[PDB]
Amino acid sequence: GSVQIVYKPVDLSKVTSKCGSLGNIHHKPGGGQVEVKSEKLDFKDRVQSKIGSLDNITHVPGGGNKKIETHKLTFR
Amino acid sequence: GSVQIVYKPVDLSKVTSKCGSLGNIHHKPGGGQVEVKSEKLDFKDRVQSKIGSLDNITHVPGGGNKKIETHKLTFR
Amino acid sequence: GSVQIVYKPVDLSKVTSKCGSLGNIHHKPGGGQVEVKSEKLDFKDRVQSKIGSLDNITHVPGGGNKKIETHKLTFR
Amino acid sequence: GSVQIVYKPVDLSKVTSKCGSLGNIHHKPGGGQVEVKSEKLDFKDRVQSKIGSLDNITHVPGGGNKKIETHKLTFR
Amino acid sequence: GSVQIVYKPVDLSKVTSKCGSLGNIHHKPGGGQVEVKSEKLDFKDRVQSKIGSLDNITHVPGGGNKKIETHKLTFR
Amino acid sequence: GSVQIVYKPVDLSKVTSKCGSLGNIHHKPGGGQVEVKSEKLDFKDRVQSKIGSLDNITHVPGGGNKKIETHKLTFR
């Protein structure tokens, strides 16, 4: 008797990760008339003043990919 | 008896990572009339003033890819 | 009796990483009329003043790729 | 009597046109298993066959801008 | 009497035209398994076959900018 | 009697045209398994076959800019 073995798996698979700030940011502060005036203020501790600024902070410790694949043909 | 073994797996697979600040930032501060005037202020500790500034901070400790593939043919 | 072994695996696979500031930054501060005047201010500790500045800070400790592939044919 | 005339108009205006194919095209034909087949066909006249092709055809005869501005100071 | 005439118009205006194929094209035809096959066909007239091709055709007869500005100071 | 005339108009205006293929083209045909085949075909007239090709055709008869500016000071 004749034997023919044809081991031809085809892998076209996609493993994909997109992580972080994906969307677009359109920030248009001002445009009209803006007055932020301050006269006589006294500060005993720390100040942050943010006027029309943008902070984008992105951390990606994750988002990695792992593909493990084993092909084995054992004959007799 | 005749034996023919054809080990021809095909790999076209894609493992992909995109991580961090992916999206576009369109920041247009001002455009109109903006006045941030300050007259008599007194500060005893640290000050941040941000006016129309952009900070983009991206950390990617992650986003790595790992592909392990083992092919084995053993005959008799 | 005849034996024919054809070990011809094909690899066209793609392992890819893109990490960090991927997206475009369009920062257009000012454009109209902007006045940041300050008259009589007193500061006892550190000051940051940012007016229309851009900081892009990117750290990529990650984003590395690891491909391990083992091919083995053993006969008798 | 003293005369002081101060002609200081400020123009910060934007006249802007964007015309044509503005949006992004993401065309991914195939992806799975596609078989297009034809055995015995006879054509007496013209044939177009399009399989996963993209045509983007853009005509912009318009989209032009016209700004006319006249400044005039006439004294006595 | 004294006469002082100050004629200091400021023009910072922007006239801008962007015309044609503005958006990005991402065309990824195939990707999976695509078979296009034809056996016994007969064509008496013209044939176009397009398989995964891209045609971008951009005509811009328009998109031009015209700025006319006249400044005039006339005294006595 | 004294006369002082100060004709100092300021022009920082921008006239700009960008016309044609503005956007990016990312064309990645094939990628997986593509078979195009044809056995016994007969053609009596002209054939175009496009397989994964890119044509970018740009005509810009337009997109020109015209700035006319006239400054005039006339005294007595």
Rounded to whole angstroms, the Cα distance separating F43 from D49 reads 15
Residue carrying the six token digits 């006369």 = F3
Cα of A1 to nearest chain C Cα, Å: 11
Q: Give kind and range of the element (H or E) at residue E56.
A: strand E54-59
Rounded to whole angstroms, the Cα distance separating B13 from F33 reads 11
CB atoms within 10 A of CB B54: 24
Residue F19 and residue E14: Cβ atoms within 8 Å? no
Residue F54 in tokens: 């890119």
Cα of A18 to nearest chain E Cα, Å: 17
Experimental method: cryo-EM
SS3 E22: coil
Contact B5, A73 (CB under 8 A): yes
Contact D24, E22 (CB under 8 A): no
Rounded to whole angstroms, the Cα distance separating E27 from A45 reads 56
DSSP code, position D30: B
Q: Which residues contact B62 (CB under 8 A, 6 or more apart)?
A: A19, A60, A61, A62, A63, A64, B19, C62
Residue F18's nearest CA partner among D24, C30, E12, D63 is D63
Contact E14, F16 (CB under 8 A): yes
Residue carrying the six token digits 């029309």 = A52
Reported in sequence order, the residue ranges of chain B that DSSP labels E, i.e. its strands, are 3-7, 10-11, 14-21, 25-27, 33-35, 42-43, 47-51, 54-59, 65-75
What DSSP letter does each residue of B33-46 carry, written as one string?
A: EEE--B-S-EESS-
Count Cα neighbours of F14 within 13 Å in the Cβ-side half-sphere.
13
**Contacting subunits of F (3+ beta carbon pairs below 8 A):** A, B, D, E
- Exposure class string for C38-66: b at 16+ Cβ within 10 A, else e: eeeeeeeeeeeebbbbeebebebebbeee
**Contacting subunits of A (3+ beta carbon pairs below 8 A):** B, C, E, F
Residue B45 region by backbone torsions, left for phi larger than 0, else alpha for psi between -120 and 50, else beta:
beta
Rounded to whole angstroms, the Cα distance separating B56 from A58 reads 8
The distance between the two most distant Cα atoms of chain D, rounded to a whole number of Å, is 102
Residue A19 and residue B19: Cβ atoms within 8 Å? yes
Rounded to whole angstroms, the Cα distance separating B8 from C6 reads 8
Phi, psi at residue C73, to the nearest 5°?
-120, 120
Rounded to whole angstroms, the Cα distance separating D70 from A47 reads 49
Residue C17's nearest CA partner among B60, E31, E25, A70 is B60
Rounded to whole angstroms, the Cα distance separating E23 from E8 reads 41
What DSSP letter does each residue of chain A carry, written as one string?
A: --EEEEE--EE--EEEEEEEE-S-EEE--BSSEEE--B-S-EESS-EEEEES-EEEEEE-S---EEEEEEEEEEE-
Contact B75, A73 (CB under 8 A): no
* Mutate: best of E2, E43, E44, E45, partner F, most F CBs <10 A: E43
Contact F56, F24 (CB under 8 A): no
Q: Residue type for A30, please?
A: G
Count Cα neighbours of C46 within 13 Å in the Cβ-side half-sphere.
3
Q: Which residues contact A53 (CB under 8 A, 6 or more apart)?
A: B29, B50, B51, B52, B53, B54, B55, C50
Contact E74, F74 (CB under 8 A): yes
- Measuring CA to CA, how many Å separate F29 from each of A12, C10, E33, E51, F35? 15, 19, 12, 9, 12
Resolution (Å) of this entry: 2.8
Which residues of chain A from 11 to 70 reach within 8 Å of chain C, CB to CB?
11, 21, 24, 30, 53, 60-61, 64
Q: Which long-range contacts (CB under 8 A, 24 or more apart) does D29-32 make?
A: D29/E29, D29/E52, D30/E29, D30/E30, D30/E31, D30/E32, D30/E33, D30/E34, D30/E52, D30/F32, D30/F34, D31/E31, D31/E32, D32/E32, D32/E33
* Mutate: best of A2, A48, A58, partner B, most B CBs <10 A: A58
Strand arrangement, sheet containing D25-27: D25-27, E25-27, F25-27
Residues E42, E44, E48, E49: what is their CA dihedral angle, to the nearest 10 degrees?
Answer: 0
Rounded to whole angstroms, the Cα distance separating A18 from A23 reads 11
Residue E52's nearest CA partner among F35, F55, F53 is F53
Rounded to whole angstroms, the Cα distance separating F30 from F33 reads 7
Residue A71's nearest CA partner among A18, A21, A7 is A7
Residue B55 and residue A56: Cβ atoms within 8 Å? yes
Tell me the H-state helices in D1-76: none
Contact B63, B15 (CB under 8 A): no
- Measuring CA to CA, how many Å separate A26 from each of A55, C34, D24, F13? 13, 20, 17, 25
Rounded to whole angstroms, the Cα distance separating F30 from D52 reads 11
Cα of A48 to nearest chain F Cα, Å: 35
Residue D14's nearest CA partner among B36, A28, E60, E61 is A28
Residue E41 and residue F41: Cβ atoms within 8 Å? yes
Q: Residue B7: closest CA among chain A residues belongs to which residue?
A: A7
Phi, psi at residue D17, to the nearest 5°?
-125, 130
If DSSP states are collapsed to H, E and C, what string results for chain F?
CCEEEEECCEECCEEEEEEEECCCEEECCECCEEEEEECCCEECCCEEEEECCEEEEEECCCCCEEEEEEEEEEEC
